[PDB]
């Protein structure tokens, strides 16, 4: 008698779950997540925006960091997402219950979020999380403005169908800083070629490399900070080694081409 296996939790490196204090990126923009997962707070005179929340168990830590910044539950107006995997959208449902936040996302991200990341094109039910509903559906190139910070959506399908880069302009020394929060360009364990659930996967990734390369991009940030060479634990030099969007796109394409060759060989 051999029973069916137990459910397996989505377990991650400790650094992904290690709380950090708010780290200022620009005059209105702060990293408020963990050492190894990005969660960006943008604070304005007319309320706050959160871009990603990390893993499901980060909800209370995000709220504590918000409070440290002076942002109350009612002040949080909007949640935006890079993509709706458990390690970036994990706490969205809980945050919606505990704050005034509404979610804006593209149709692909909204559908995946509403499924709690189940029936993932590549991971199946391996990384599920509490489902949430989007309040507003955004189209490619659509802008959303909160307290004069203008967020533009740039669709960059591949890592997920609904993967998005969000760009906005903040300041640092009275000078503009064009921030690009670019989504993952990885395909971890994906079948790339002839995948029946994603027939045009390769062409979407190629288009997404080009989109990322061309973003307005004084400062690049990524959901996994290591992807853009950020080190959130390095304090005053956290962003010193950060890649350009151009360099991030180039490295991702080189890796992707390598993975294609390995897939053909395998
Ligand atoms: O850093 C990256 O690019 C990818 N890292 C991840 O953790 C991704 C989400 S972005 N998830 C994953 O690989 O999940 C694999 C998996 C885990 C449990 C069960 C099935 C599949
Ligand atoms: Zn992902
Ligand atoms: Zn991830």
Swiss-Prot record:
The organism of origin for this protein: Stenotrophomonas maltophilia
Documented activity regulation: Inhibited by Hg(2+) or Cu(2+), and by chelating agents such as EDTA and O-phenanthroline. Reduced enzymatic activity in presence of cobalt, nickel, cadmium, and manganese.
Protein name: Metallo-beta-lactamase L1 type 3
EC number: 3.5.2.6
Lineage, uppermost ranks: Bacteria, Pseudomonadati, Pseudomonadota, Gammaproteobacteria, Lysobacterales
Annotated catalysed reactions: a beta-lactam + H2O = a substituted beta-amino acid
Keyword annotations from UniProtKB, A to Z: Antibiotic resistance, Disulfide bond, Hydrolase, Metal-binding, Periplasm, Signal, Zinc
Top EC class of this enzyme: hydrolase
pH dependence: Unstable below pH 8, unless zinc is present.
Residues involved in Zn(2+) 2 binding: 87-88, 224
Any one GO molecular-function label of the UniProt entry: beta-lactamase activity
Pro-piece positions: 1-11
